[PDB]
Copies of this chain bind each other. A is one copy, B any other.
Amino acid sequence: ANRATSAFLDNPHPVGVNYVDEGSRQFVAVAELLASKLIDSSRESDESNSDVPFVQAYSKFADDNPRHLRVKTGGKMANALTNVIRSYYSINAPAIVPQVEIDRLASKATVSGDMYNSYAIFNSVPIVEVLSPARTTVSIVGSDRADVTMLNTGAGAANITFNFGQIAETVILKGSVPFQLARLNQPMPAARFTYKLRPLDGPFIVVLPVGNPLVISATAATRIQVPLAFNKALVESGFQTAMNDGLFDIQNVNYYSSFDEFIISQYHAQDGINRVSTCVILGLALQAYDQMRRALPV
């Protein structure tokens, strides 16, 4: 008997515990709000035929007026946002930003750092384990759409067990050819192309006939509570920008292809609820980072 698991779900590293309180949460909300005004100031500059709208936006974000002989960096808030993002990813990252600096930057705009007033859908499909008997090959490829390739070289039909965890809300399975799937201690129905199932129900048994390989595609949806200012497209771009800039370059940590995989992998840890709150705050910080760095490249 062999077992297989998703690659992105292996060994989630611990996340940081700093910059989670109310003042730090409001700093991230202010940074997101002010960085958004920076991007919109470009369109205002085009319409107004002048750089005054951009100068006003940068002055509020950086406490200093822009210069022509200096490369625009963002000043204290840019430095604070960058260092705070580093601390969120790993517990080994230092917490360099002082509290006093965080409170001063959090007073720039009026926001509430409530990160539980909305939700988002995360599409990473968790396959905790797939148990197959001898003379059966199982390969799991993919993270957003997981394709499971199954081959039965044995004499008779085999029973393969799926375990999708206890966190995902729904999972939809679509097979290359019609197949049979049922819960444990349940009878099997007629072969169908598509199955919709709740992972909380229990481990699922799929009957593998002997012959050509059977491939099953898995798509899952998970609901995680996020602030109302959350935007998945901006968060995903911020994740790639931060990884390129080396903000995640620190020893004894894991690397993920997308923010979708990062948050779901942390949610499936030993105590994944503790890390979901920090990961969401990292998402808002990354959304602020993508806007800030696209307006002020460096």
Contact = CB atoms under 8 A, between A and B. Distances in A.
Interface of A: 4, 7-8, 10-11, 33, 39, 42-43, 45-51, 54-55, 58, 66-72, 109-114, 116-121, 123, 137, 139-145, 147, 166, 169-170, 172, 174-177, 184-185, 193-196, 200, 202-203, 212-213, 215, 217, 219, 221, 223, 225, 228-229, 232-233, 237, 240-241, 243-244, 254-258, 293-295, 297
A273 to B, nearest CB: 8
A159 B112 CA distance: 54
Nearest to A37: B47
Contact of A137 (B4, B42, B212, B258): B212
Contacts of A72: 68
Identify whether the interface residues of A are mostly helix, strand, loop, or mixed: mixed
Contacts of A8: 174, 194
A194 B67 CA distance: 43
A141 B176 contact: yes
B70 A117 contact: yes
15 contacts: A7-B194, A10-B194, A42-B117, A43-B229, A46-B114, A58-B68, A69-B117, A120-B294, A121-B241, A142-B147, A144-B145, A172-B257, A185-B203, A194-B255, A196-B243
Contact of A240 (B48, B67, B121): B121
Identify the 10 closest CB pairs spanning chains A and B, nearest first.
A45-B112, A219-B257, A196-B255, A221-B240, A7-B174, A118-B294, A51-B68, A10-B193, A169-B244, A121-B240
A259 to B, nearest CB: 12
Given A7-B194, A194-B7, A215 B297 contact: no
